[PDB]
Amino acid sequence: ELARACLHHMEVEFAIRVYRRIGNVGIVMSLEQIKGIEDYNLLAGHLAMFTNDYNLAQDLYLASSCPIAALEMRRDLQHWDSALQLAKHLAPDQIPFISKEYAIQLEFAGDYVNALAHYEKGITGDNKEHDEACLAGVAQMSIRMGDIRRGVNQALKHPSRVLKRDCGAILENMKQFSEAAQLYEKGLYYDKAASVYIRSKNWAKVGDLLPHVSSPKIHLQYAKAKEADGRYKEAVVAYENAKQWQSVIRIYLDHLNNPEKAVNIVRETQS
Amino acid sequence: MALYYDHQIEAPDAAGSPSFISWHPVHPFLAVAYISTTSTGSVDIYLEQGECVPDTHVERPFRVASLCWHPTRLVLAVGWETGEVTVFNKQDKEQHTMPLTHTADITVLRWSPSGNCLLSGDRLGVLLLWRLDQRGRVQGTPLLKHEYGKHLTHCIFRLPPPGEDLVQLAKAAVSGDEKALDMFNWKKSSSGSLLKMGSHEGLLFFVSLMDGTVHYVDEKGKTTQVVSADSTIQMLFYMEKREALVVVTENLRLSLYTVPPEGKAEEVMKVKLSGKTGRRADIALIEGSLLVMAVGEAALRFWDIERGENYILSPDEKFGFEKGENMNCVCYCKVKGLLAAGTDRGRVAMWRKVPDFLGSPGAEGKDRWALQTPTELQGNITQIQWGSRKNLLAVNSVISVAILSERAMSSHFHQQVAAMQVSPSLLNVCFLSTGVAHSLRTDMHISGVFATKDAVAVWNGRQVAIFELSGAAIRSAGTFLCETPVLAMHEENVYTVESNRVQVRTWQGTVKQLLLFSETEGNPCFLDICGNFLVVGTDLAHFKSFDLSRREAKAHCSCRSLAELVPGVGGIASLRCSSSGSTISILPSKADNSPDSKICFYDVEMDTVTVFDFKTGQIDRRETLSFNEQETNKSHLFVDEGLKNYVPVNHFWDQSEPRLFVCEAVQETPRSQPQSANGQPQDGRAGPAADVLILSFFISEEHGFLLHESFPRPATSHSLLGMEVPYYYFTRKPEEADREDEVEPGCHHIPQMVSRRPLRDFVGLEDCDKATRDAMLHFSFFVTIGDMDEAFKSIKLIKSEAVWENMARMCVKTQRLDVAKVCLGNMGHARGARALREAEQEPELEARVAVLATQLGMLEDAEQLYRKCKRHDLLNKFYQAAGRWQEALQVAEHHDRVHLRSTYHRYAGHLEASADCSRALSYYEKSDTHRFEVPRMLSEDLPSLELYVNKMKDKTLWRWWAQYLESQGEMDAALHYYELARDHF
Amino acid sequence: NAVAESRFNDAAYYYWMLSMQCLDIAQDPAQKDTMLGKFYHFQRLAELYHGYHAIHRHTEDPFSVHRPETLFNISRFLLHSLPKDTPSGISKVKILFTLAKQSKALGAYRLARHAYDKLRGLYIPARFQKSIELGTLTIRAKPFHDSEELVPLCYRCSTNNPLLNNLGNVCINCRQPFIFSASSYDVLHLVEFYLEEGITDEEAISLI
């Protein structure tokens, strides 16, 4: 009560003392940054922001020597319609950047239609890294909106390997295993790709990826699947890659009659 | 609590009153001696269920006088009232009679610790040492014969001395103990007792006589008198870790003697112990040093030999004991820290030690102990003993012998319902979604319980009873005869076990469906249900699982053998499954039936086992879809070296989250216990660690095993009962439930016997349910998986400012500032978002994360981060802002000397604001700003300023005071002070 | 630290020392323009804090070492010299309060009214607020003109300049920058001049 009253009556020195007594160090540090401000409207605006009255804070900032503080507060609060309206009057160059951060928030919130519109508005044509981050958002939102073609083609044409991972992840959440595995494959995430191809039961695609598959667990699932398919040659190389040496040992003995190859395995195991 | 199941032994109808009992020192088998009405003696061996072992019966026309099991082999020695000694071998089914050489009652019988020799002694004082083969047969003739001419009372072997406890030997010798020097000094041992560095015959021992004397015997068999007590010796022990003999007489006189290798004993102390003389006091020596006596009194008497301190433990009527109920016998389990005593009213009292587990925190005297609920039995209890490494106890009344097997009160939890067995015929049932508790008394000794949102099932191994919730009252829904060892439930379906089958039944016991096992798969003996899935486990360690989304239960997992999946496993100790049925978790047991440090997880879709071993921290993986005994894939992803001493004992899966799992693990104690040089609690010597750990895991096909949490089991909690988000479930101590609820006689006040603990990421968010539960479950999984974008996506439907605050607090630990900006925005924390944007002027991530920690009120983390950055400037500003000025000045004086004047100035300003002007002056002086700040501060109190100016004698201050006098027109005084200031101008 | 401890004469000296450091570092061609910018910036701060030290002493201390006309000149010089963003430790309230009180004392009664109306646009502390309530009445009471002897002459164009103006420390007629006595902040009867192309500094001295 005493603290809130000190903020409303603008007694910053008593507000500092009282929040220091309470042990709210965060508010002490922030008020110690404002203690030197003599502009009534700027000071009153910062204090209104600390009492969570954002509309009053905006009006006071606009009346102050520094209006840009209102845009910054609204951007910090992620109140994007108000931040865009302030940006149109005070800083037009920030509009594409604010539209990207708004499109990230709309992408998070589930409004994929407006997120896609705001990522397309966020394209500047000058800042390549920012435009790439907008095009990444367009690809991701085209995916979630069911234009999987537009979003996958964009993610393939785009220079980022991280976008290919993230589009692959969204597509696995959608159970779109083929396009998830394709974007992981084109992103050089060969293990993640192969694991999603195992979910799709595509032992042919996994077999093309196996020279790049690092995971023993993927080779082990493939070795089981190929033994069930009667492809003992493939299942052997896969159990060898998986370091499941005794399956290979039994196969070379019982099924292949090739025990010279059974012994070649044993020395690294000492089994 | 642990309830100890009373397996009354199946004594033959020809067996009379039991006389003595003896466990095998390792194996779960009990020898029992009987005296018939015709005074014939017999001996029988029993399994842990109290079943008599076939072909083990032994009888003679005269009484059993002594029993002694071999230390390691399945061999029993029996001594008889005639002087016959007989060795029985259970493995080979042979019995051998020793050469008739005694002519009187065998009062002493003891295996050597190597087990290669047996010692026998009679009432006439003839002592014989025998060598025996691996079958228990005598190799020729006695290695030793001696004739004391007096009744032999006790023998103990001196286990081959390595040199005391070697640190205690070294300290004793450095402190000038000439007998510790005689242990080190190799030239003086003319008897063949070198400090026994090898597989020596182990023929060093002490023997006592009824006159009160003790004789030592050396490796050559020479006898020397070591003690001469004033009465009959009631008990004898050897403190190996001190090379010291303890003697207790029937007049309750304790004496301790240090004994060198040569058998010339020297006395450490002699003390008259408290207690009633004229009864045979049973005595135990807990760990060495802690002497405990059951004198035939309403309390156990304790004497700490190393502190020279005494205390008592008495049974308390709050647990159901009677007033004045006397304890006749006492024994201690060293492995789990459990003290037991047998009463004249037929009860076993037990105290759990506040553990001397390898890191558990200690206590002094009586506070070393916590009284557990009684075990009630028939007739006056005359002897007890703790046995096999499972923590079994055996009990001998005037009427019968019982084997007591430890269980976690057979207890169960499912669907936010719990059932806790308060007594052999009483349950406390908690509907944890409503907070309501019910007391459910049964017409049977309950062997197990199972629970659901609608109904609870109980059984005794002859019948099953089922009870339905009917508003605010539990009512009997059915009761039927069924010999089931275990049971489970899903909706209106009951799952019961018979020979080679599981039977699905209605609540009235009507069989709906059969699930079949072959003789090679073994009998079912474990059941668990999670989500819509049943898992089943068998004797000789096979398992199966079934889908229950259909009334026809359907085979989800085909049969697997745990012994083929995991070599060296002796059995199953427990089974559970995931709420998807995709993963099964298994506690194996070793061939000696001890709990295994391994836990096994079987993937049903991949058809593979992953085995995690607590002793090594390794994860194995093995494959056998095709027949196999494979080499392990090995991953070193577990960094926690703290787990090496723990063993899993209970385990569970989340009923809603198939990726989420938990295990309880105990810190097991070694087979025999040492002591310290000082009188500390025996392993509680150091600072705290968990008596029992609770470990929770996320389990996935893409990332393997991830430790979600590790924590100590709460001090108010006796075991893990379950888990279902947001909560782990635990069994509460009735020792503590009565300490906050004030109660009066005349109402059956229901104790709150189930405690619950929130999961780490759910602390302060436990109101979470349904779709918010599923979102937070996905969040907790995805955060621990490290795929933070999926965690952040799972939260998108949650508007709660508290969830955004908890995620911001977790951004401080994960050092993820990008997500923290969005969290601060979603919570409306505009000052924190500004503070992070300004903190981007600092190049270090840790300094920026410290600003976030400061704005969230995490001051400890913030302090640690600023220290880690070496940013003593921001740390000083932080301390100032926290009002911790002394720490701020210390950091300024040692690491931030350039701000020290500014820090003194700011502190002086806060002291001035606090109306402490005197200390403000001292710090303005230290900041060298007293020339302008002091006159400003004291400008209202002119006399104090004048005193100050005259005290400092500073030139600049005399000029200022002269300017003040000059403006006031006091020119003669202004001149005086300008003359003092030497300001000639 | 000097600014935070209100040692504004030490702060002015240290800003001058910083400017001299920047000028030495500007001998490296890679940092020249950046460090020349810092040199002018810090010199401007050194002149601001050297002036504001007198205002701070006059407003904190009970008695003044500086003369009324010196504090009046400094207060006017500071209001013309200060950017849109105020430097740390500098107070526009102390400057306008010192201006209003010294303008009242010197007979700049219209300027004193204007300074008290400017103070009402600022967050005034309680000590100054009490004096400003009495000061506002007691000035509004006085005549509606300023003493002609206070009005600064431009020595380049012989024009009398209004006591505050929107262009700052330049003549309203010829836009000549004013040069001020660093003791008193009176305008100095100096005009700055520039050499014609192809004259060296050494040649200029040889001709002078």
Side-chain angles (χ1 to χ4, degrees):
Chain A
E1 283 174 22
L2 167 61
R4 284 187 216 159
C6 294
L7 297 176
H8 290 307
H9 288 288
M10 307 219 302
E11 285 298 348
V12 180
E13 293 182 38
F14 284 98
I16 285 164
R17 183 189 174 151
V18 173
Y19 283 116
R20 196 181 291 144
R21 186 63 178 186
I22 291 162
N24 195 315
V25 179
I27 294 175
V28 171
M29 286 188 80
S30 57
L31 286 172
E32 286 175 5
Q33 291 155 358
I34 285 151
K35 180 179 173 183
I37 299 185
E38 298 199 328
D39 180 345
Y40 184 95
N41 295 299
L42 188 62
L43 175 60
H46 289 293
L47 296 171
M49 180 171 66
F50 295 178
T51 55
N52 293 328
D53 200 344
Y54 316 119
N55 293 324
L56 175 61
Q58 180 183 308
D59 291 341
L60 290 166
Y61 282 139
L62 289 174
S64 80
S65 58
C66 294
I68 296 168
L71 181 154
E72 289 187 29
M73 174 189 73
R74 289 297 194 180
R75 180 161 70 184
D76 283 344
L77 289 164
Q78 307 186 299
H79 296 164
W80 302 115
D81 292 336
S82 304
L84 285 172
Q85 185 176 7
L86 291 168
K88 286 176 179 181
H89 297 169
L90 301 177
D93 58 286
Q94 297 297 294
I95 296 173
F97 303 93
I98 295 163
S99 297
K100 175 194 161 195
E101 295 184 62
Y102 188 18
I104 291 164
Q105 196 85 343
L106 291 164
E107 168 159 26
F108 153 76
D111 189 357
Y112 309 145
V113 178
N114 290 281
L116 186 142
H118 279 292
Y119 281 127
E120 289 187 358
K121 289 178 178 180
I123 298 170
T124 62
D126 296 342
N127 290 90
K128 294 183 181 181
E129 299 191 320
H130 170 79
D131 289 353
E132 282 163 24
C134 296
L135 290 165
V138 179
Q140 292 162 207
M141 294 281 76
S142 302
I143 283 159
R144 300 198 216 190
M145 282 297 302
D147 284 349
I148 302 172
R149 291 182 261 99
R150 189 190 184 218
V152 172
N153 284 11
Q154 284 170 336
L156 290 171
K157 289 182 179 184
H158 190 290
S160 181
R161 294 177 185 166
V162 178
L163 176 59
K164 296 180 183 77
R165 186 199 69 182
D166 294 351
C167 291
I170 293 160
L171 287 164
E172 186 170 38
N173 284 265
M174 299 169 69
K175 302 187 181 183
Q176 303 293 7
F177 302 130
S178 171
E179 284 57 60
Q182 181 194 5
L183 277 165
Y184 285 127
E185 180 187 332
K186 289 286 180 182
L188 315 176
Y189 309 99
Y190 289 104
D191 290 285
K192 185 65 186 180
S195 75
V196 181
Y197 288 129
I198 285 182
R199 294 183 74 174
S200 80
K201 298 187 179 179
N202 194 341
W203 306 110
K205 261 288 191 178
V206 181
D208 295 343
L209 301 206
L210 285 200
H212 302 77
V213 168
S214 68
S215 178
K217 305 165 189 173
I218 294 179
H219 289 281
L220 199 173
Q221 284 165 92
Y222 186 99
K224 286 165 166 284
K226 291 282 179 166
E227 180 167 26
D229 295 342
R231 292 195 178 200
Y232 290 105
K233 300 287 187 167
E234 288 213 73
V236 155
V237 172
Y239 282 129
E240 290 179 12
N241 293 344
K243 303 182 180 178
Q244 286 299 282
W245 300 119
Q246 256 181 57
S247 289
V248 198
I249 292 167
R250 175 164 190 238
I251 291 161
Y252 279 140
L253 299 168
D254 297 1
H255 309 312
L256 303 179
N257 301 297
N258 285 333
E260 298 173 52
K261 304 194 175 187
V263 292
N264 180 321
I265 283 174
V266 172
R267 180 59 179 173
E268 300 181 50
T269 79
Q270 304 184 3
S271 179
Chain B
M1 316 72 76
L3 266 179
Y4 295 86
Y5 273 83
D6 55 328
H7 304 283
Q8 295 186 356
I9 72 175
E10 296 186 330
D13 294 344
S17 303
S19 60
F20 308 99
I21 63 162
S22 188
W23 285 110
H24 190 285
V26 179
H27 307 305
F29 311 122
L30 187 79
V32 182
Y34 305 100
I35 299 168
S36 75
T37 54
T38 52
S39 293
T40 69
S42 67
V43 179
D44 288 277
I45 300 173
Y46 298 85
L47 301 178
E48 67 182 294
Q49 307 89 349
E51 298 189 19
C52 195
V53 184
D55 309 327
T56 65
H57 188 68
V58 177
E59 181 143 55
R60 302 297 283 131
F62 41 77
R63 298 185 181 192
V64 182
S66 197
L67 292 178
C68 197
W69 286 98
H70 185 289
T72 58
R73 302 169 202 148
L74 293 168
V75 178
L76 175 65
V78 187
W80 300 91
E81 184 169 40
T82 49
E84 186 173 4
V85 177
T86 61
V87 178
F88 177 79
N89 171 339
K90 185 266 175 193
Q91 182 64 7
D92 298 308
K93 298 183 180 179
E94 295 181 6
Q95 181 177 3
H96 312 284
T97 284
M98 311 291 281
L100 294 182
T101 43
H102 299 289
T103 61
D105 183 14
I106 302 300
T107 59
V108 178
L109 189 69
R110 204 81 185 236
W111 291 95
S112 59
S114 63
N116 297 329
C117 299
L118 175 62
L119 173 150
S120 64
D122 68 34
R123 175 155 173 81
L124 292 170
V126 189
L127 188 78
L128 302 175
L129 181 73
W130 303 104
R131 189 178 288 142
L132 295 95
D133 80 356
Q134 298 192 353
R135 299 181 181 274
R137 304 171 190 186
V138 185
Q139 293 189 338
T141 291
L143 300 186
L144 178 62
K145 174 174 180 187
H146 197 74
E147 297 185 27
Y148 296 100
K150 305 188 193 185
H151 175 120
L152 291 153
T153 45
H154 310 279
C155 180
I156 62 187
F157 282 86
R158 183 175 183 166
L159 276 63
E164 217 177 299
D165 178 15
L166 183 61
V167 177
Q168 298 214 42
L169 183 68
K171 287 182 178 185
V174 171
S175 73
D177 184 345
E178 296 191 333
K179 298 323 191 191
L181 295 170
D182 288 348
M183 291 165 203
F184 281 127
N185 196 338
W186 70 263
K187 293 180 179 179
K188 284 184 180 184
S189 283
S190 57
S191 67
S193 190
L194 183 66
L195 300 181
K196 288 288 154 178
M197 290 171 288
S199 54
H200 299 287
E201 294 194 283
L203 307 185
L204 298 176
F205 61 74
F206 299 92
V207 170
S208 56
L209 302 176
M210 195 172 189
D211 68 357
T213 63
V214 187
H215 293 261
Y216 174 68
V217 181
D218 77 8
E219 288 267 275
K220 299 186 174 181
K222 299 183 182 183
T223 194
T224 52
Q225 191 188 345
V226 286
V227 182
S228 194
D230 57 21
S231 64
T232 45
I233 292 167
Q234 180 47 36
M235 194 54 178
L236 199 78
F237 314 93
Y238 203 69
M239 294 184 59
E240 322 88 333
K241 279 59 180 175
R242 290 196 179 254
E243 284 272 60
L245 182 73
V246 288
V247 189
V248 187
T249 76
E250 286 194 68
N251 294 351
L252 311 185
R253 205 168 196 187
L254 171 65
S255 307
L256 177 72
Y257 299 91
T258 42
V259 195
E262 304 323 281
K264 291 180 180 178
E266 297 202 342
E267 197 172 276
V268 184
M269 80 284 278
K270 183 177 302 180
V271 181
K272 189 173 181 182
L273 307 186
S274 62
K276 293 180 183 184
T277 50
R279 286 175 178 167
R280 188 187 180 276
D282 194 12
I283 311 185
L285 184 61
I286 293 189
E287 304 137 25
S289 185
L290 181 59
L291 196 75
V292 189
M293 307 166 69
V295 197
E297 294 181 32
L300 290 180
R301 297 184 176 272
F302 297 73
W303 212 86
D304 187 310
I305 290 164
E306 288 162 327
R307 291 181 150 237
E309 289 189 321
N310 75 292
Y311 63 95
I312 71 175
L313 301 178
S314 60
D316 182 352
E317 301 181 68
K318 292 181 179 179
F319 303 106
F321 298 99
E322 282 174 72
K323 227 188 186 89
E325 174 171 356
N326 302 287
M327 288 171 290
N328 310 318
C329 54
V330 63
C331 192
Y332 177 72
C333 177
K334 293 165 291 194
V335 178
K336 194 163 180 179
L338 311 175
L339 176 56
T343 75
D344 62 351
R345 303 303 180 182
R347 305 191 249 275
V348 178
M350 305 193 207
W351 294 261
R352 180 169 294 159
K353 207 179 195 189
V354 185
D356 278 318
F357 302 162
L358 298 161
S360 172
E364 300 193 286
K366 175 169 179 179
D367 296 347
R368 294 171 174 179
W369 300 101
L371 177 53
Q372 303 310 291
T373 45
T375 307
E376 299 207 295
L377 297 170
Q378 294 178 8
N380 174 17
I381 297 160
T382 65
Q383 188 200 355
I384 61 169
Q385 197 194 13
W386 294 93
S388 188
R389 298 304 85 85
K390 287 186 68 178
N391 316 291
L392 302 179
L393 170 62
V395 181
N396 177 21
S397 89
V398 180
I399 304 174
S400 62
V401 175
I403 293 167
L404 294 195
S405 71
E406 185 169 284
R407 297 193 178 123
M409 70 172 35
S410 80
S411 55
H412 212 280
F413 162 93
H414 187 64
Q415 295 167 336
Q416 309 296 5
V417 185
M420 303 313 305
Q421 180 170 347
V422 198
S423 88
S425 59
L426 192 66
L427 283 148
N428 187 350
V429 182
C430 306
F431 289 85
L432 299 149
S433 58
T434 67
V436 181
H438 299 292
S439 186
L440 175 63
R441 186 171 286 105
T442 57
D443 64 336
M444 75 178 84
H445 293 297
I446 306 146
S447 68
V449 64
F450 197 94
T452 69
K453 66 182 179 177
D454 298 327
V456 173
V458 311
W459 60 101
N460 70 348
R462 297 182 180 94
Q463 68 185 329
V464 179
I466 302 183
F467 303 89
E468 173 178 34
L469 188 71
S470 63
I474 298 181
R475 291 186 167 94
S476 182
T479 298
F480 60 98
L481 301 184
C482 178
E483 295 184 344
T484 200
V486 295
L487 175 158
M489 305 173 75
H490 175 273
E491 300 189 356
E492 299 182 8
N493 309 288
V494 190
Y495 300 81
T496 55
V497 171
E498 288 194 335
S499 306
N500 305 304
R501 62 185 168 262
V502 181
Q503 299 163 321
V504 194
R505 296 178 183 252
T506 69
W507 295 355
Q508 309 81 9
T510 297
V511 178
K512 291 170 138 169
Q513 177 188 7
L514 304 179
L515 311 177
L516 299 182
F517 290 69
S518 63
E519 297 189 327
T520 53
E521 292 168 348
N523 307 283
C525 66
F526 296 99
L527 302 173
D528 177 54
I529 293 178
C530 197
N532 298 306
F533 298 88
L534 166 71
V535 68
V536 186
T538 69
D539 62 30
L540 303 177
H542 297 53
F543 60 88
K544 299 190 192 193
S545 82
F546 304 88
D547 180 344
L548 313 181
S549 65
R550 313 184 271 296
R551 174 168 165 189
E552 183 91 320
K554 268 285 296 179
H556 187 65
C557 185
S558 65
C559 202
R560 290 288 171 260
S561 175
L562 184 60
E564 302 306 332
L565 281 165
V566 191
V569 172
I572 295 168
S574 184
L575 285 198
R576 301 291 183 188
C577 67
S578 67
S579 40
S580 56
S582 68
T583 310
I584 298 169
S585 61
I586 314 188
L587 300 186
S589 59
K590 294 206 172 192
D592 68 356
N593 308 287
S594 67
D596 189 348
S597 61
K598 299 181 197 296
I599 176 168
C600 308
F601 302 87
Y602 172 87
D603 189 315
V604 176
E605 296 181 56
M606 285 59 261
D607 187 19
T608 55
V609 70
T610 45
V611 186
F612 172 67
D613 189 344
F614 281 65
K615 280 181 177 183
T616 64
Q618 293 154 339
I619 298 165
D620 306 349
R621 194 171 194 129
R622 295 176 177 89
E623 157 51 359
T624 189
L625 185 154
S626 50
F627 183 73
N628 269 282
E629 313 175 66
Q630 311 213 59
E631 303 64 38
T632 57
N633 272 303
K634 290 185 178 180
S635 61
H636 302 290
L637 296 176
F638 257 75
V639 182
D640 194 353
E641 296 198 290
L643 298 186
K644 292 182 187 180
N645 296 326
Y646 285 85
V647 175
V649 300
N650 296 300
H651 64 171
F652 307 93
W653 289 83
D654 192 278
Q655 295 292 337
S656 70
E657 180 45 281
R659 287 79 56 99
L660 176 59
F661 170 79
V662 67
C663 186
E664 177 171 38
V666 172
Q667 189 176 61
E668 185 171 296
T669 320
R671 297 183 180 186
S672 65
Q673 279 276 67
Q675 286 296 2
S676 47
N678 296 310
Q680 290 166 341
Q682 184 269 1
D683 279 332
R685 300 167 274 104
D691 306 346
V692 187
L693 284 173
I694 313 299
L695 307 184
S696 72
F697 306 75
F698 277 113
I699 300 170
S700 64
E701 298 95 308
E702 296 78 25
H703 299 281
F705 291 74
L706 306 93
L707 189 75
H708 181 194
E709 304 181 50
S710 171
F711 59 104
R713 189 174 75 196
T716 58
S717 293
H718 192 119
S719 67
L720 186 78
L721 175 64
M723 172 181 70
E724 191 193 327
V725 160
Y727 305 113
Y728 306 107
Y729 287 99
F730 298 95
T731 69
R732 185 180 279 131
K733 289 169 180 175
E735 300 93 300
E736 294 250 57
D738 295 345
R739 292 178 175 172
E740 295 188 325
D741 294 344
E742 291 190 324
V743 175
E744 291 189 326
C747 178
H748 294 292
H749 224 288
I750 305 179
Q752 195 189 100
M753 294 182 76
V754 178
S755 64
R756 78 182 85 175
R757 181 198 168 255
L759 274 78
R760 185 194 74 185
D761 309 323
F762 291 83
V763 178
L765 299 176
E766 310 86 347
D767 297 350
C768 173
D769 207 1
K770 303 301 186 180
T772 307
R773 200 203 299 189
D774 295 344
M776 284 197 66
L777 283 165
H778 286 304
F779 158 82
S780 61
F781 176 57
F782 295 145
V783 168
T784 58
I785 293 283
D787 199 347
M788 299 297 287
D789 296 344
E790 299 195 314
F792 183 35
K793 289 162 194 178
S794 72
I795 279 182
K796 73 191 176 184
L797 304 181
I798 300 170
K799 298 180 180 182
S800 180
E801 183 179 322
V803 177
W804 293 105
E805 188 192 323
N806 276 29
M807 187 151 60
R809 287 183 192 257
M810 291 297 292
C811 294
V812 174
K813 292 186 180 179
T814 54
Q815 296 182 348
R816 265 282 180 168
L817 293 176
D818 50 339
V819 177
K821 289 176 177 180
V822 181
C823 297
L824 288 165
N826 286 344
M827 70 176 69
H829 194 324
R831 80 176 187 271
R834 177 180 170 190
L836 277 189
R837 288 192 297 105
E838 292 193 17
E840 300 195 346
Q841 295 184 355
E842 314 312 327
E844 302 93 348
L845 185 74
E846 293 91 335
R848 297 178 189 183
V849 176
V851 169
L852 175 66
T854 305
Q855 291 297 347
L856 291 172
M858 300 174 71
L859 302 180
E860 292 175 3
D861 292 330
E863 183 181 352
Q864 287 177 358
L865 287 158
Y866 292 129
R867 288 171 184 273
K868 284 175 178 184
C869 323
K870 302 184 180 181
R871 280 201 173 283
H872 298 288
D873 53 349
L874 298 185
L875 183 60
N876 186 359
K877 290 182 181 185
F878 172 78
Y879 282 139
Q880 293 177 32
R884 300 179 186 181
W885 296 106
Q886 291 84 12
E887 294 180 4
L889 293 183
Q890 286 177 4
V891 172
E893 283 170 13
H894 289 84
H895 306 90
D896 185 33
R897 206 77 184 204
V898 184
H899 289 136
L900 181 58
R901 295 192 173 214
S902 73
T903 53
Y904 289 150
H905 174 72
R906 287 180 172 188
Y907 185 34
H910 185 245
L911 289 167
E912 178 177 345
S914 307
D916 191 333
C917 293
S918 54
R919 290 186 178 177
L921 286 168
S922 68
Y923 284 105
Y924 283 133
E925 290 176 359
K926 288 182 180 177
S927 71
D928 207 11
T929 55
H930 63 287
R931 297 177 186 176
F932 57 96
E933 290 294 352
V934 170
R936 182 197 55 63
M937 180 174 70
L938 294 177
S939 56
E940 293 187 354
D941 190 4
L942 303 181
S944 299
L945 184 53
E946 186 186 319
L947 286 172
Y948 180 80
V949 167
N950 293 344
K951 186 179 175 180
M952 290 298 286
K953 300 172 184 169
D954 193 352
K955 297 170 189 172
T956 62
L957 286 172
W958 285 328
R959 293 172 195 184
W960 191 103
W961 188 243
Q963 291 165 10
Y964 190 112
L965 292 163
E966 181 173 11
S967 72
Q968 300 316 276
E970 298 192 47
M971 294 299 178
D972 296 337
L975 285 170
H976 194 70
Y977 277 107
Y978 282 126
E979 284 173 30
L980 281 170
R982 303 152 187 205
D983 187 8
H984 311 331
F985 170 78
Chain C
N1 290 351
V3 170
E5 293 163 19
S6 307
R7 295 188 291 117
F8 301 116
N9 188 263
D10 299 345
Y13 172 58
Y14 300 158
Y15 275 119
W16 176 75
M17 287 287 288
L18 282 166
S19 87
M20 297 296 95
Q21 269 180 334
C22 295
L23 189 65
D24 260 3
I25 299 156
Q27 298 200 337
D28 181 21
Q31 302 171 81
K32 181 179 174 181
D33 295 342
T34 313
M35 290 290 168
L36 279 170
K38 288 183 176 183
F39 156 78
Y40 289 113
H41 172 58
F42 296 152
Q43 256 286 69
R44 184 177 180 171
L45 291 181
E47 292 188 330
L48 284 165
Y49 287 112
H50 180 65
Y52 179 70
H53 172 64
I55 302 301
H56 180 76
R57 272 189 169 183
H58 173 68
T59 51
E60 294 300 345
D61 301 341
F63 309 107
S64 183
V65 178
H66 303 84
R67 296 186 181 182
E69 302 92 331
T70 292
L71 291 164
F72 175 89
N73 286 341
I74 288 167
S75 304
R76 293 174 58 252
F77 166 85
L78 293 172
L79 293 169
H80 290 169
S81 302
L82 285 162
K84 284 180 180 179
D85 298 339
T86 318
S88 50
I90 303 191
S91 170
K92 290 185 176 181
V93 175
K94 284 174 165 170
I95 293 163
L96 285 161
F97 176 70
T98 304
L99 185 61
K101 189 172 182 178
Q102 299 298 354
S103 299
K104 179 193 172 192
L106 295 171
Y109 308 119
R110 193 178 191 126
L111 180 61
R113 282 179 178 80
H114 190 55
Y116 286 116
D117 281 355
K118 281 192 173 191
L119 281 158
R120 291 167 174 267
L122 297 177
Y123 185 51
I124 302 156
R127 166 178 165 86
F128 301 108
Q129 183 208 319
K130 183 181 179 183
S131 189
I132 284 163
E133 287 181 46
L134 184 148
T136 305
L137 278 178
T138 53
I139 205 73
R140 289 172 80 255
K142 293 301 192 178
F144 193 53
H145 67 278
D146 304 316
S147 182
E148 296 188 341
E149 300 191 344
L150 300 171
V151 187
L153 189 73
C154 181
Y155 302 93
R156 184 169 179 192
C157 72
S158 307
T159 306
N160 289 322
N161 292 268
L163 296 171
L164 295 178
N165 79 78
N166 301 321
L167 306 179
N169 290 323
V170 306
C171 177
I172 64 152
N173 188 18
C174 70
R175 302 196 175 198
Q176 179 64 40
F178 301 144
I179 298 153
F180 301 100
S181 186
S183 59
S184 71
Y185 290 79
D186 302 294
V187 186
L188 267 175
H189 61 268
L190 287 167
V191 172
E192 186 168 4
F193 71 85
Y194 299 86
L195 305 180
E196 187 170 45
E197 299 188 327
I199 305 172
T200 72
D201 292 319
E202 297 192 330
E203 180 172 19
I205 287 161
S206 79
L207 296 165
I208 292 159

